[PDB]
Amino acid sequence: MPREIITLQLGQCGNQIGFEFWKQLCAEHGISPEGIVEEFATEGTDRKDVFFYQADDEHYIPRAVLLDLEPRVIHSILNSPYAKLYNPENIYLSEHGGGAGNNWASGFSQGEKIHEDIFDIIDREADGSDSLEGFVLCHSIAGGTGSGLGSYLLERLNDRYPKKLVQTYSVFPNQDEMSDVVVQPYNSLLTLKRLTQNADCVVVLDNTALNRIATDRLHIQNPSFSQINQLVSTIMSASTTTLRYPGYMNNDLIGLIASLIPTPRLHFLMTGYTPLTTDQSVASVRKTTVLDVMRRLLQPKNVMVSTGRDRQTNHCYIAILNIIQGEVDPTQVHKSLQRIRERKLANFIPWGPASIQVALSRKSPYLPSAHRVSGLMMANHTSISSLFERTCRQYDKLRKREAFLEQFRKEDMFKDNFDEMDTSREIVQQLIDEYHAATRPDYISWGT
Amino acid sequence: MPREIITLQLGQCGNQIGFEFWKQLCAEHGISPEGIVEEFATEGTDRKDVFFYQADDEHYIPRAVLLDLEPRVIHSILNSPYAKLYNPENIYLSEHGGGAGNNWASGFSQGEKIHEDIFDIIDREADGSDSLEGFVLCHSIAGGTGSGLGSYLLERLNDRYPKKLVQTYSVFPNQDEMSDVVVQPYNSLLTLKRLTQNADCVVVLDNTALNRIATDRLHIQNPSFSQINQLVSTIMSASTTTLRYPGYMNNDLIGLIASLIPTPRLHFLMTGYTPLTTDQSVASVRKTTVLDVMRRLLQPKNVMVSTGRDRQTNHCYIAILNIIQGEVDPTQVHKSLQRIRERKLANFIPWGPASIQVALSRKSPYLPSAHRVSGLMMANHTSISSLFERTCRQYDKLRKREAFLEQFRKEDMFKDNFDEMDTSREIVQQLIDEYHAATRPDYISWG
C-alpha cells in the first residue's frame, strides 16, 4: 500500500492554501473537485492512496482536514466545488468567523478547542489510510489563524502519531511585503516552536521568496497572500509528485526526507525549482536544458526560501535532491549533473557525503505542465540559517516588543507572557547556528 | 419442501409493504395483479407455496392474513396492484375505520376484536401452505394500526402455532427521521414487547436505516412510510428468492437464519444486501465481482440497520453469512474473502469458529434481473443492538415524557400510563446488551 500522508489545513490562510493544494492535487490526479476521477485521469501511475481517500466506490476524496479560526476560508472551501474533497468529519470551522486577529495564540487556542475533534479526525484519516506514513500540515506561519492552528495541528499530529513523521509547511513572513499580520514574528515563533517540538520536518516557505518568484518567474507584479499560498501549494505538489505519482524514486515520505533531515531537530528544509515558467507563458515552449535548469537553480532567486545576506555563516548546501518531472533526455540529465558539479551549484557539508541528487519522475498526465521539463529541488542549505536566523531575530523582536500581542493575550498561550516566543526564537537561532555548523565538519554534531 | 411463511400485514406501512412485496413477487413469478400466472411465466421453477397459495391452477393467492386497526391501509391495499392477489376472506379490516390514533394499545384492542377473523385468515393461509412453518407478520412499530395490529397478529400466530417458531419483521421507528406518529416510541415498545413474549426471533428493522438508504443510495429525500415499506419488501424479496426459487442452498428460511441466531435470547438479527443499487440505476448491469460486492456491502448505505455511534462499546460482527444469487465465479468469492481479510472488512467472534457461509440461489426466470449477481447477507453483529437500544431509549423517553399519550390514553391498555411501553423498552435494552455481549467470549455464559 502507498505511504499515505494526511494533509492538515490550519487557519484562514492555511485553509486557503490547503484548498488550493487539494485543487491542484485533484487536477494532477484527474480528480474532479467533487472527488470523481476525470476521464482524462488515465495515468494510473499516481499514488492516490497516499494523498486521497475513497469517499465512495467511485469518488476519491483528498485526505485533507480543513481547520480555520476564521470562517471565510473554510466556508469558501465548503462552498467551493471542492467541498467533497475534504472529509466532513475532519472539517472544523469556527462559528465566530472572527479568526485569530493575526494572533498565533488565538489560533492555537482555537485548535485546542477543536483538539478532541481534530485528533478524532486525524485518527479517522489514519484508519482511512491503508499505510499512513504521518501528517503533513499546510498552513501559513505569518498570520494568526493559520499559524496558531498550524501549531495546534502539529501538536495533535505529535500526540496522535508520535511514531509517525509530522511535516509542517511553515510560511516565513515576506520581508519585502508589508505583512498585515503584525504579530507574524510572534506567529512565526509559535510555528517554529511547534515545528521543533511537535513537527518532524518543517519546510520553510519564505513569502518574500514566493513573491520574488512570482515577480521574476510567474510574472506576478504584486503576489497576493492567496497567490503566495497557491504558489506554495503548487511547489509542494511538484516536490511531492514522486510520492503522489509513484516512480523509481521517492515513493515514500520517509525515503524522501531521509536525505533531507541530517539531525532529528535539524529538519528545516529549503526548496528550489527549475525550470520556472509563468502560468501565462505556457505558449512558448522554451527549450530549457537540464544543464541550464541546474545553472538557474543555483540562483537565490530560484530558491523557495528568501535568505538574508548572512555575512557570518559560510552558507552551503547540506544536501540537495532535484526531483525533475516531465520529458527529460538522459544526455541532458548528464549535462545537468556535469554543470552542477563543475559550477559548484551546491557547496556540501564536510561531515557527511553530500551532492546535488537528481531524481527523474514522470509528470502527472492529468496536470498540464507549463514547462516541457520541470524540476523541484528540496535542499538543506546553510543559507537557510540566514532565513532561520532572521525568523529567530524577528520572533525575539516581537516578543520583546509585544507587537500585536494584545490579540494573542486573549488566548492562554500568550495571555501572561511571550516566553514561548522567546524560547522559540532561541531554538531557531540554535537551528541557524547548526545550519552554519552544517557547512562545517562539525555538522556530525549539528543540532546538538 | 419449503418452509412456508404466512404474512400478516398490519397498518399503513405493513399493508404498503405487503402490496409492494406481492407486486414484486408477481413480477418475479410472472403473476398478474389478479394472481394469475402470465403466459410468459413458463418457468414453473419458483416455489409459490412458501408465500402464496393457489386459488386455482392459474390464480396464485398470497398465504397472507391482513389485520389492521385502520381502514386506510386496507383501502390502500384494495387500491394496490395486489388487491386481487389476496383472498378477500383472508383480509380483516376494522369496521370503525377510525384507526388506532397512532396508539399501539388501540391497534392491539382492534386486533383483539378481529382476533378470531385474523387467526381464521392465518389458518386459511397455512392450509394453502404445503409445509407452513408459522406466520411472519410484516408491520411498522411506529404507527398505531401497524403496531397494535402487528402485536395482535403475532399473538394470534403464537396462540394457533405455539409449538412452531414465530419470526417477525418489526419496523422500529426512524430515530433520524421525525416520525409523524408522535406516539411512535410507545407503539414500538409495545411491538417489541409482543416480539419478546410471543415471537421466538425478532429481526430489528430500523426505519432510520431505510430512510438513510433511500436518501444516500436511492436519492429519496423523504422516504414515505409506503416507500420505506416497499424498500423493505424489495429487500425481503431479494433475501427470500432462495426460499421462493429452490436451489442447492438456502431453500428454507431456517437454513438461512440458523447461522444468524446463536442463542434463543440473542435473536435480534441484522440484514445486509450486496451489490446495493438504486432503483433508478437498474439500467447498467455492472459486472460486479464478489470482491466488489463485499466492498459495497461494507458501505452503510446498504446496511438495513441504523446503528447509533456507540463510543463506549466496540460493537462487532460475531459472524456474517452472505447468500449470493446469480452468476458468481468461485475465484471471485476467493478474491472477495482475500480482500475482506486484507481490509479487515469483517470481524468475527474470537471465542469460536465462524465463517462466511455462501448460499447459491437461482434468479426468477420471468423477472429480468438488472444485476448479474445479487446477494443477501445474514450476520450477527453487535451493532444490531444499537437499533434495539435506540428503540428502547426512544420508548423510555416518550413514556417518561408522556408524549402523545393522549392518543394512547383512549385505549385501556395505555389509558392511564405507558408502563407496558417502558417495561418493553427495558426488555429491548436487555436484548441490546445481550447482542453486544454476543460479540464477546462471555456470550457462552449468557443467561
Place this chain on the structure above:
Amino acid sequence: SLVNKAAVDYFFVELHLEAHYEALRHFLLMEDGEFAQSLSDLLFEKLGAGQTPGELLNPLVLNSVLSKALQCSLHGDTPHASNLSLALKYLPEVFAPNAPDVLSCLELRYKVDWPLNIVITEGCLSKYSGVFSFLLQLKLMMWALKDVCFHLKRTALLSHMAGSVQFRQLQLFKHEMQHFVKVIQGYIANQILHVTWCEFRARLATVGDLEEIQRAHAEYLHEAVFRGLLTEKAAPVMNVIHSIFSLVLKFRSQLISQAWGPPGGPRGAEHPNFALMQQSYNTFKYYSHFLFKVVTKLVNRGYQPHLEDFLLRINFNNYYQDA
C-alpha cells in the same frame, strides 16, 4: 475429422448427452431443492429415531419418501427426476447414532443407454452414486442437527427457557457448528457442484468423440471428488471432516435426547444432558482448532492447495484464527 464431427453431432442430438447432464443435475444433483429438503428431514427423522436399514431402507419406506419428496419438489415430477433411483449398497443392522456416514448405504443411480453407456460408464455412475450418498449423509446430519435445534427451540418456548445458561451455551455451540457446516457446504457446492459442473459443461461442449466424452466425464467426476475432498490425498482430511460431523451429530443427539426443563433458578432451565452438551461443544471446539492447525500446516506444506480454499471457507471471518 468428418467422423469426429458427425459423432459429436450424433451424441448431442441423438444421445442427448446434454439432456443426460441436465437430468443428472435435476435428480442426482438435488436441483429440486424442495425434494432435497423433504428427503433430508425425513432421513434425519428416521436416523434419529434409530430405524434400522430394514425398517428405514425398506422399499415401501424408500418409495414413500421418494414420492413425497418428488411431490413436494417443483422439479420432482420432471422426466429428468424419473431417471433417479434410490438403491441400497448394504443393509445395516442398526443405524449408528451420530455417525456422519449413516446414510452412505443409499445410492442414486443414473441409467445410461447405448451408446451413452460407453461414455457414461458404470464407473462414472458409481462415482456419481458415491457423491450422492455423501451429500445425502451430510444433509441427514445437518437435518438431524436442525431437528435437534427445533426441538430445543420448541421446549424453550413452552418452558420460557430463554434464560437458561446451559441451553444458551448449547444453542450457541449448535449455531456455530451449523454456520461452519453451511460455510463448508457452500464451498463444496461451489467448487465440486458448481465450478466442476461448469467445467464439465465447457468440456461436454468440447467433447469430440466417445472416448473424449468418457474422458471429459471422468475429469468432471475427478474434479467433483477432489473438490468434494473424496481424493486419497484428501482422505485424511475427509476422515477428519467426517469425524467432526460425527461429533456434531453426537452433540445434536445429546441436545435432542431431552427437552428443555422449566426455568427453575437464576441459571435458567437445566438440561439433563447439559453437561454432555457442554462437553461435546468443548470437544468440537478443540477438534475445530486442531483441524484448523492441521489444514494450515498442510497448506503451508503445499500438499493440498485446495485445502487452502477449505481453510479459507472454515476461517473466512478469521474467527478460528483468533481462537
Place this chain on the structure above:
Amino acid sequence: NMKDFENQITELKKENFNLKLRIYFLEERMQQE
C-alpha cells in the same frame, strides 16, 4: 437401477404369463385333438 430392476421384473413377469397362456391354449388344443 431400482427403476430398471422394476422394469426388468415387470417385463419378465409379462413374458412368463404370455408364455403360460400360450402353453395353456396349446395344452387345451392338444387335449382337444
Place this chain on the structure above:
Amino acid sequence: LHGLLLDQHEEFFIKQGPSSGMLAPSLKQFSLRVEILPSYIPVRVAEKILFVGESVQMFENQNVNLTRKGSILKNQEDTFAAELHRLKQQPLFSLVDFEQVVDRIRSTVAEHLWKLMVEESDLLGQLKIIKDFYLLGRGELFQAFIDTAQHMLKTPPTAVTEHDVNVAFQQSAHKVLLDDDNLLPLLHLTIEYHGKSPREAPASGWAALGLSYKVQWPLHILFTPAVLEKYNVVFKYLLSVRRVQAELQHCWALQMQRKHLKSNQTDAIKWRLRNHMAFLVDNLQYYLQVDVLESQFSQLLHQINSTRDFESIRLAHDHFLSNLLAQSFILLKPVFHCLNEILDLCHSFCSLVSQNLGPLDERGAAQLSILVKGFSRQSSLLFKILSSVRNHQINSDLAQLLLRLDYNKYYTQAGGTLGSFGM
C-alpha cells in the same frame, strides 16, 4: 523442412546432439558434426544451416503441441524442395546458391516467427511481467510488498515460509491495488534458508528468497533457464536494494518520530550517517534504474520494435541483459562483494539509528561508531573504484555514479568516505 534428422547411419555432417529437453526434445537434439562437416560446407554456412534446421525442429515441436498451423513457408516448402532438386541437377555444388536459398527460407521463417511471438505469443507482455516482478519494474509495488512483508522475510526462510511470503506478497499487491490474479500465479516463492531444506544458505533466509516465473510455450524458448536465473538474480538484487532503502527510511522515521526528543550529538550523528547512506543508496538505485535498467529496457524495446526477425529479438534481449549485468557490476565479483559489504554495513547503521530515538546508549554508541567507520571505509573504497572506472572509461554508468556522488564535491572533499557518524 521437417526439423527431422533423418540420419540413422550418421552419414550426414550433422550429428544428433543431446536434446536438453512434452518438453519437446531440445533443438540441441540435432548438432553439427564438425568432425563430419564437409570442407566444402563453410563454417558460416554450417551455422546458417544449423539455424535453419533448429528453426524447423522448433516449428515441428510446436506444431506437435500447437494445432495444425501450417509451416511458416507453407506450400513454399515444396518450392524450396524444387530449388534443391535443381541444385542437385547443378553439375557443380555452389555454396553461394545453397546459402542464398537457406537464407531466404531462414528469413521467411524468422519473420513469421517474430510475428507469431510478438502478436500471437505476446512476447512483450511476458517481458513486461518479468520486468515488473523479476526486474522489480513495479518498484512502488515491490517497495510496498517489501514494506509489508519485512517482518516475515527478515527471519530465515522456511519451506512453509515460502507460502507465507507469497501470501504476504498477494496481500501487499491488493493493498497496492495490484489485483492481477494472473501475475501472482506467475510468481513463485523460494527456498528455506538457515533454520526455518533450510539447512544451506550463505547469508540468511532474507537473501535466499527468490521469485520464479512460469514461462508459457513457445516463449519458454526465449526465457531460457539462464534468462530466468538472471531474472532471479535481478529480483534478489532489487529486493536487497529495496530492503536497504526501507531500513534508511525507517531510520529517518525514527529520527522524525524522535524530533520531539532533543537531538544529542550521538543521535544527530546517527541521523546524519543515515541521511548520507540514504542519499548514496538512492543515487545508486536511480542510476541503476535509469542509466542501466531504463536505458537497457528502452534499447531493447526500440530494437524489438525495429526488427522483424525473432532471432534478432533474442539477440537484442541477450544484449539488454548483458548490459544490465555489466552496469550492475554483478560480473565485477570484487566490486559486487564490496557493494554487498557496504549494504550490510548500511543496514546495520539504519537498524541502529531506527532503534535509538534518543542519544545512543553505550551499546548503541558502539554500534554507531562501528557503523560510521565501516561506512566511511566502504564509501571511500566505492568512490575510489568509481573514479578508477571513470578514468578507465570502462563503464559509463560507473562514471555517472561517481559524478553524482561528488556533485557538490562533499565526497571528493571527504575523500569519498561517507562522513563518520560521531559516537
